[PDB]
């Protein structure tokens with residue numbers, strides 16, 4: 071069934087599963103035409119497919135050329151997401167194939183279900199969590215590869231860097247979602263907090279600074295305070 | 308004019324013949340139904356006064372033999388049976404008419420309702436959906452499940468309707484995933500019409516039978532089937548014009564004949580709003596849409 075607060079811990083059991091998010095697949099800037107009308111110009115996007123235990127993020131890059139000559143792009147984008155998720159599952163052998171795909175938006179269910187008639191042992195599920203994966207493009211490293219790409223391309227990342235040498239999957243995932251929640255609510259503040267201390271390096275092969283445990287605790291607190299505050303600034307409390 | 312004689316009426320029962328029905332009292336002298344129009348399939352059906360659970364009934368075609376009803380106090384129901392002795396049969400029937408113990412199929416001659424509800428329904432096809440081949444007539448009741456229901460228990464007693472499933476390989480061609488699912492014309496015209504049913508008439512006949520089983524017995528799975536055969540058409544962008552125009556007439560008469568009070572369970576909102584307002588055929592069912600809006604506008 072649906073994935074919610076209650077069956078939270080299942081995402082960290084032995085089963086190797088993926089989360090698919092499609093909110094950054096179809097991206098447009100909206101501008102004005104000479105005649106005074108409004109037109110959209112597409113820019114590159116990605117599917118955000120992630121193993122929440124290891125953190126491996128199969129970033130599929132969606133080149134604006136895939137939209138060319140096509141109608142009803144918001145609807146196509148979800149069928150495109152489903153074709154690309156399907157192709158990924160089709161490259162991996164049976165043992166290597168994941169056990170459950172959880173789509174972060176309910177509109178993806180039928181698209182994927184249809185593009186997975188070929189794999190009957192992989193359950194497609196929705197979730198009732200408001201997961202912040204759309205803030206994925208606030209991660210500089212990931213934004214840059216998407217914007218620079220010249221062709222369809224798949225890139226491999228581990229979104230937890232080396233965190234799993236020291237903390238658990240559960241703990242790695244709570245940190246990631248706190249970071250992404252911060253980023254979504256007020257990106258500038260979120261980013262300030264991450265780069266404040268110049269001594270801490272964002273090594274080229276990392277999205278996230280190489281904090282110590284103690285620095286992660288301080289960082290994590292500061293993100294909490296941010297998330298709390300933007301809620302007040304928005305509802306006045 | 309054909310006759311369906313009844314041996315007797317031991318138990319209080321509501322007897323139906325096609326869309327007509329009358330109350331028969333326990334041991335009321337009642338010996339069957341005369342003036343039944345030859346040339347169409349019919350259904351004769353029953354609902355006991357004591358147990359309104361289990362509506363049940365028998366599809367038959369008087370051209371295929373002489374059929375009569377006899378109550379069975381062992382199994383507790385009115386049973387359709389065939390008489391092969393043609394002279395034993397005429398004699399029984401004649402005697403019962405002379406004593407005038409038969410009610411008269413009460414057909415108004417301006418009324419084409421039953422014709423229009425059964426236009427495409429043929430006993431040969433019924434007999435493949437309801438398998439019991441020692442008999443020329445076909446039993447149905449409220450509780451029988453479909454072959455597709457039993458997929459997701461007793462098969463001798465299943466409704467073997469044609470399996471339709473929009474999220475399946477049969478329905479979706481590899482490489483046309485998005486196209487075949489938002490526009491089912493491939494599935495309707497090639498898979499089903501050209502492939503399984505062969506012509507629109509057989510399809511329409513299953514369509515029609517499903518609806519009637521739904522209406523007369525409240526057979527839940529038949530309603531599902533009905534709604535599914537409609538959806539496939541309304542969800543197809545390319546339908547022969549001859550199919551659309553007949554479909555409009557088929558549904559018009561189904562909506563007309565439905566009890567005003569049963570439209571809550573037997574009509575699936577999602578399917579009808581799609582057919583009438585969202586689907587490709589929103590503009591192509593003028594009669595069906597006019598009578599739905601004037602009779603059941605709540606649902607929309």
Ligand SMILES: CCNC(=O)CN(CC)Cc1ccc(Cl)nc1
Nearest residue numbers: 086087088121124126166168226
């Ligand atoms: C989606 C299927 N694989 C996963 O979920 C994560 N993998 C487990 C099978 C670990 C992995 C896989 C591939 C590469 Cl290049 N690096 C690591």
